[PDB]
Amino acid sequence: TKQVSWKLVTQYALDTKCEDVFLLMGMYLNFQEAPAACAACAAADQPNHFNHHEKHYYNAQIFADSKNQKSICQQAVDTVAAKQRVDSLHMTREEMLVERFNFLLDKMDLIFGAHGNAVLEQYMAGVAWIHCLLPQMDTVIYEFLKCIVLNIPKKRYWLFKGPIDSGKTTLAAALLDLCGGKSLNVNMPLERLNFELGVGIDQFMVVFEDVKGTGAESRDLPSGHGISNLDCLRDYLDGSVKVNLERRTQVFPPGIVTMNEYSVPRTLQARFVRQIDFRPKAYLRKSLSCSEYLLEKRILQSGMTLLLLLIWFRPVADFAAAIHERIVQWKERLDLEISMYTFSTMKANVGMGAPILD
Amino acid sequence: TKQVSWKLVTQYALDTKCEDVFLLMGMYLNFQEAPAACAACAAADQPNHFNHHEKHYYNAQIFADSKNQKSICQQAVDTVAAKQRVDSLHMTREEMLVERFNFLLDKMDLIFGAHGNAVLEQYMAGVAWIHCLLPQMDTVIYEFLKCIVLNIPKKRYWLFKGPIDSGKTTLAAALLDLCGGKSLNVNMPLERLNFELGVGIDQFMVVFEDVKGTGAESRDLPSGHGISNLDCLRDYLDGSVKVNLERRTQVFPPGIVTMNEYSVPRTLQARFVRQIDFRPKAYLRKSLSCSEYLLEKRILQSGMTLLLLLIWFRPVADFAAAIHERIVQWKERLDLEISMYTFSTMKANVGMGAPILD
Amino acid sequence: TKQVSWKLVTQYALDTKCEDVFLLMGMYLNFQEAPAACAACAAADQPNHFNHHEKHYYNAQIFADSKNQKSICQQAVDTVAAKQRVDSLHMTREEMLVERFNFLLDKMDLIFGAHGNAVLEQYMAGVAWIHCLLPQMDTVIYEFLKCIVLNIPKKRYWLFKGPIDSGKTTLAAALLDLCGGKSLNVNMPLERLNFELGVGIDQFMVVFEDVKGTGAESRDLPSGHGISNLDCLRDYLDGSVKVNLERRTQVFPPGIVTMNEYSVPRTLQARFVRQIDFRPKAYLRKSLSCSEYLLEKRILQSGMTLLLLLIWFRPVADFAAAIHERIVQWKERLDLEISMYTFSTMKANVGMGAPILD
Amino acid sequence: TKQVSWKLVTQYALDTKCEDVFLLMGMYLNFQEAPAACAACAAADQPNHFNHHEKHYYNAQIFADSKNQKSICQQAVDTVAAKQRVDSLHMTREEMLVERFNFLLDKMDLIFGAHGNAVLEQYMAGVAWIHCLLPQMDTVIYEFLKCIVLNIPKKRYWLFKGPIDSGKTTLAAALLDLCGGKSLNVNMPLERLNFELGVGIDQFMVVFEDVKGTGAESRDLPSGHGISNLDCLRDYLDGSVKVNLERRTQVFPPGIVTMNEYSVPRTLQARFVRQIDFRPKAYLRKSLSCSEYLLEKRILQSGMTLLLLLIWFRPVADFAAAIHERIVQWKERLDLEISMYTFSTMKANVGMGAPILD
Amino acid sequence: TKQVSWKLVTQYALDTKCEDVFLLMGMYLNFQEAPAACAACAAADQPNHFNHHEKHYYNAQIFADSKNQKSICQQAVDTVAAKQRVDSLHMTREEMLVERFNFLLDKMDLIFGAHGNAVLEQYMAGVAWIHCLLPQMDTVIYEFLKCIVLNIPKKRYWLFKGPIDSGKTTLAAALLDLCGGKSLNVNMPLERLNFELGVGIDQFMVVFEDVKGTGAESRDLPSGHGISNLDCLRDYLDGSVKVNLERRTQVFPPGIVTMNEYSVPRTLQARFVRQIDFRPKAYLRKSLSCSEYLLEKRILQSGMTLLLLLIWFRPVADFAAAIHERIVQWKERLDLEISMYTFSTMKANVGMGAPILD
Ligand SMILES: c1ccc(Oc2ncccc2-c2nc3ccncc3s2)cc1
Ligand SMILES: c1ccc(Oc2ncccc2-c2nc3ccncc3s2)cc1
Ligand SMILES: c1ccc(Oc2ncccc2-c2nc3ccncc3s2)cc1
Ligand SMILES: c1ccc(Oc2ncccc2-c2nc3ccncc3s2)cc1
Ligand SMILES: c1ccc(Oc2ncccc2-c2nc3ccncc3s2)cc1
Ligand SMILES: [Zn+2]
Ligand SMILES: [Zn+2]
Ligand SMILES: [Zn+2]
Ligand SMILES: [Zn+2]
Ligand SMILES: [Zn+2]
């Protein structure tokens, strides 16, 4: 009998950055049918499927007859975690952000392409709104990325502080996506916290989302163990030394802490290089109600939007040389659909609390 | 010696959407006896058995001699979870509702068919009662389905609020079945909650059934951690971002929250696009007591009844093209047994608190 | 077919002191490509890769085709833990410190070498600052190392006591790195403590980092179970007998306890042979702000810096004979870049709170 | 291909009483190199290595190529636990103490031999100090050993009661080592206690080290669940019946309970056949400060010292016939280095709080 | 190569009623040496070894070379648990007591035989003391055995109530041994209790040893959850129905409950068919102090002593026909060493608080 090439199954896992055994099992199996008569190949909308179907068709036919499908898939997913551990130690943080930028760019190529469905002018309308949320937003995003790549101790955490629906969550969400980090919850007690800080292992950045304080109940704010728990994690936030995470020994990743208006202890405040104070501007919310497509299509919280922001505002030099061809081609695509004159118009419509696109 | 085709066992699992190793083991084994002399084949009431017996008879004879039955079955059930992960990412939410609609329709074909036992006029009597429970109920159900398919953030949760035996539970039950979601319990403390929110992984929708509040004990209402727990799950309900579920990383599924008359916090209230206030109407309960067959046959809480409601009221265009032939044939079946004139009569009998069928 | 030499995979694990299955899996796999056309070989910056690529190229080609990659890697990592248990019993504590010194020295050879990026004069600037933090710092570090090697009961624990940003943490961090120990947390309750003291198994030294007391809340100090927990661990700290650790039976390793200004019980105070009282000197902090490169490059907390301190100040006799050639060559490298005259100048700039390097 | 003799790996485990899989893996592996060119063989200081290297050289060469090293080692360690269970039932308690005495004697042969480093006159200086700690100390140690071998119910527990640094801990430590028992902690709550009493399975004796009471906080004594927990363990201490230990069903082993000056309940006091009241004598501590080598070399708490005490004081008849040749030869070794006249001088120096050796 | 007969290893496990994998591993291994030159065979004191050595010598030689020793032993121990489950359902309770009686009798044959060490007149001295503890003690023991065999609901529990050192514990211990039951602890909270009641699965009888009450602290009695926990276990004690034990579904075994003088609730008191009130008689304790050999040799708490009591007092008819030959021969052995005249003398010495044997 024939024998499955585990190495080739493993190749696909690597090529698609598959961290899911089950997803790899069903994804590989869909490759057993003939590509010449394949509808998902004809549709050309799942690159993880149409770019790989011809390469894995015979191997997937063998795989379909295996008694050992999960075991083959476990080794593959394990090779992915292995490749990840290698890079977390071998790769420079700039090399890691380029790798992330390519991910968003591949996704962008697809959804804004021939077989995609997303509308670029809608995302550009989003870029405008985002650029209206803070003064020098292009520099605000750029300084954050630099902050994360450099990852300098006591100078790698940004605190987002504002009330509900003031942009803080959305910016944190969008920045987390742009970097490709993970979101943490520190409102649980010290006991369960150690396994939750483990979600930080081999991560480029992290966002401690919606950190809650105490005694602020008199202000319609929930009491939580967040600020106290974070106050303890001095070694984590500072990143002067390597911490001992459980779920590895490494410098805890840099990122963002988001919270409502709670009192920050003197000690926890000293842990932030930067504090942005988000406040609700009536014009921003009115415009969004008038531009419903943004919320409906989850555009604002997207890293693609923030990559698009940066592609629009920054020269090719402001990006890594390994991705100059990509940026350059995306700059021409933007030029086609939008001009600096019409981009300022978009922002003007935001100030007027009016629909961003006319 | 002969060797079992795991692929063919796996095929059956897929074909019947089997998520149970034990059920697949006993189901496959029943196929070892000769179909020509099979009583369950002659009875033709278990489609999962009579549609598959001829295809798996020789393989099941081999399977019956295997030392590795659970392992063969585990791979099959695993292929099912795999196929599920693939779709949760690849399939459109409309494609997922059609897949569900076909499930209810296959069940309907059977129980209302030659070998079935359920009485269609009894289910139609149920459709009437359901249509009497709310103004524009056809549009109420239709708007919910659209809500779920579109799955728009801050605009994907419906709150059902009413006292005991006022229709809220039954509608939620029936809608949950129609969509094929799961039911959750948030009255437990924050600690056990995380594994319970895991019941949400790869689900089309969810119903947080019987959410309890506090201090309402003075009103014969039980105290519970429900409303507070839900108040914390802002990121879950809104679905603006991907949450981290444990039992996957995904947008938490949309659905319904059901509760008795408890005070809803300003923050938890802002999470609902729609709030339906169920109140006990004497005529509805009297009619049901007069129509005992509905409760006895679990007709009201059935998605089949709500599919039947929609087949009765909506034109073929209001359904997906992939299921037009099915709807069309079911429309002719309804025409045979019921007329618009007699359907209004059914509703008239409900208003009179009288037996729905005469 | 060909068969992987597990012994050779195991060899690499030993040679690189790999305690990580995943890291060994991805590290071995990177050896499958041809060394002659290998970019990581041409770059010559990952010694764990370029020193081993030619030796493991054919074996890694076989490994790449294995179905048993994790199992092969588990045996290797297990041989490492085995080799560690052997030494913890067979090796003299001086032999263990030399082994550690070689580790820092190999790292130093690389980062200060042809393919390295670190700047030696920056680390030397760090040596200066460190030597300004305490009187007779060379003798302070030297006495600690002797303390650890000798590991004499009731005379093997040093207590670092000072406020935030006074050098205590940094010295403890740097000394921990120089020895190659682990850091512990005793602020958790007695229950979870036993598994945390397990982090001490087969360790040369340990640092109980940031031990918290009680009632000192009136002084902006957090309440913690640290001092009480440590007060109980008399048998641990003294090291007169073998304790029973869980995660082995051994003398608990010696080291440091660091704490803010909290009251030390009479009994816990008797457990320390030495107590250094760190106090914030304005000139030290001003100079560091003026020398940002130190903090940015994590130089102060490095054992490499403290090895460099000792290489600068101590004659070849003050080190073990097994590493005389290394010390001697590093002494010539330092002579080239720095003189005693310019080293005193560096210290003079520290006293002036001025940039250490001119 | 060649095949490893598991039986021979198992033999080595038995021969060295190896209860550690990892230690056996690294210990066996060190035997793969040629004994003729082996430095650890030439050094002749690790009997577990030099006595076995020639016997396991070829088998270790095979072992080095095995894919199944941990499994081979697990069976070996399991044979050790098996051999232990056999003896705990088959061996007489005198046979078990001889087996222990041989262990200390083999260790003594080595460290006081050609390749050893320990100084016998230093240990003899220790014997003196120990003999000064209690009247008729030779008879005190002898009566304890008899107590343990006979293991008579309600007459097998000795309570050591004294303040910090009064000899109680050291005697308990030394006696525990002489017998080869284990140390227990009963200051934890009843819940975790059952698994901790499991440390007692197949043990010759146990020491409940540093048992704490309550309300004695007014006397600078820590509150603990020790005395109460022990008060419950009537069936354990008495040893009239077989208890049900969890980690076996057996009589709980006899031994010592050590505590500071806390009130002993009437019921817990009735459980002790003997109570020795240790009190700090200024001369004993002064002499020890003057003889630093004792503390530094962990001589006092050693069973070797107490075996040496007994070899010095007791005639060959006072020991088991199976070890008469060993005792006799050790008696000649002592005669060479020490006389009764100079031993009394050592004790005289203790009374004077002066260095024991002149 | 040769292959081990697992069936024969399994045979030995059955033959010796081995419930311990490790004990079976070391016990089987001791059979590898030649019986003709075997010292344990020549000694003839371990029947589990000398009766089986010749039968398992060749198989044990094969076993010694196995890689699969624990697995072979696990199947054997499993066959024992299997044989036990079979009997718990198939065997009559009289058949189970005979099986137990044979166990004590085999042990008696050995220790009172040619190679034994126990002195029969010492055990007979014990029989006397035991017969002095209660009026009609032969009938008291006999009625208990009948009680246990019949196992009639609400009429199968005996409550032993008395203070410390009044005979209650010793009688319960001795009766538990005679029946071959297990001892339980109900002083723990309801949570851990369910796994502890699991110790009752496939048991002939159980003793809830030292059950503690509350509020009796004013009487130097410890507070405990015993009496309350037992009060809940109505279905357990009564044995009218089958309970659901966890560690099986069966009637919970009958036995004894022992407690100090605590108040028994009306409901818990109704659960006892019999209550014996043990009180300290000065003559009984004085005699025991005068007969130290009894306590030292654990004679009183032995089932062998109570079997010996019954062999002395009861005619052959009072025992099961399957063991008449054994009883008859033991009756002749007793006749040889003791007469009714000298047995009454023994009892007379007990009343006088004098040494039982003259
Ligand atoms: C409904 C509910 C909420 C809405 O607002 C938003 N929803 C989703 C994401 C962001 C926003 C807003 N961001 C800002 C930032 C600054 N000033 C005001 C706002 S509002 C809009 C409609
Ligand atoms: C016994 C117990 C309960 C009953 O009522 C029901 N039982 C089962 C399901 C639903 C209902 C009702 N729904 C409504 C909705 C609106 N007004 C009144 C009702 S009563 C009927 C009989
Ligand atoms: C910002 C934040 C903190 C800073 O100080 C430091 N940071 C990192 C590591 C060490 C220090 C200091 N060590 C000492 C020792 C003695 N006197 C004063 C100091 S300050 C400097 C800038
Ligand atoms: C430092 C710290 C403690 C010291 O004492 C000791 N250390 C280690 C072990 C034992 C002792 C002592 N044993 C006794 C017994 C009776 N009277 C006095 C003592 S002191 C000595 C120096
Ligand atoms: C020491 C400690 C205790 C002792 O008594 C005992 N020891 C062990 C087992 C039983 C007893 C006793 N049983 C009874 C029964 C009735 N009256 C008095 C007693 S005394 C004897 C010595
Ligand atoms: Zn395709
Ligand atoms: Zn059939
Ligand atoms: Zn290379
Ligand atoms: Zn050697
Ligand atoms: Zn024998």
UniProtKB/Swiss-Prot annotation, chains A, B, C, D, E:
Enzyme class label: isomerase
GO BP, one annotated term: DNA replication
PTM: Phosphorylated on both serine and threonine residues. Small t antigen inhibits the dephosphorylation by the AC form of PP2A.
Co-factor binding comment: DNA helicase activity requires Mg(2+).
Residues that coordinate or bind Zn(2+): 49, 53
One Gene Ontology cellular component: host cell nucleus
Hydrolase as UniProt keyword: yes
Domain spans labelled SF3 helicase: 136-291
Keywords tagged on the record: Acetylation, ATP-binding, DNA replication, DNA-binding, Early protein, G1/S host cell cycle checkpoint dysregulation by virus, Helicase, Host nucleus, Host-virus interaction, Hydrolase, Inhibition of host innate immune response by virus, Inhibition of host interferon signaling pathway by virus, Inhibition of host JAK1 by virus, Interferon antiviral system evasion, Isomerase, Magnesium, Metal-binding, Modulation of host cell cycle by virus, Nucleotide-binding, Oncogene, Phosphoprotein, Viral immunoevasion, Zinc, Zinc-finger
Main location: host cell
Amino-acid positions noted as binding ATP in the UniProt annotation, renumbered to this chain: 162-169
Cofactor: Mg(2+)
Domain comment, as recorded: The J domain is essential for multiple viral activities, including virion assembly, viral DNA replication, transformation and transcriptional activation. The LXCXE motif specifically binds to host pRB, RBL1, and RBL2.
Functional note: Isoform large T antigen is a key early protein essential for both driving viral replication and inducing cellular transformation. Plays a role in viral genome replication by driving entry of quiescent cells into the cell cycle and by autoregulating the synthesis of viral early mRNA. Displays highly oncogenic activities by corrupting the host cellular checkpoint mechanisms that guard cell division and the transcription, replication, and repair of DNA. Participates in the modulation of cellular gene expression preceeding viral DNA replication.
Self-association and partners: Forms homohexamers in the presence of ATP. Interacts with host HDAC1. Interacts (via LXCXE domain) with host RB1; the interaction induces the aberrant dissociation of RB1-E2F1 complex thereby disrupting RB1's activity. Interacts (via LXCXE domain) with host pRB-related proteins RBL1 and RBL2. Interacts (via C-terminus) with host TOP1 and POLA1 allowing DNA replication. Interacts with host TP53, inhibiting TP53 binding to DNA. Interacts with host preinitiation complex components TBP, TFIIA and TFIID to regulate transcription initiation.
Protein name (Swiss-Prot/TrEMBL): Large T antigen
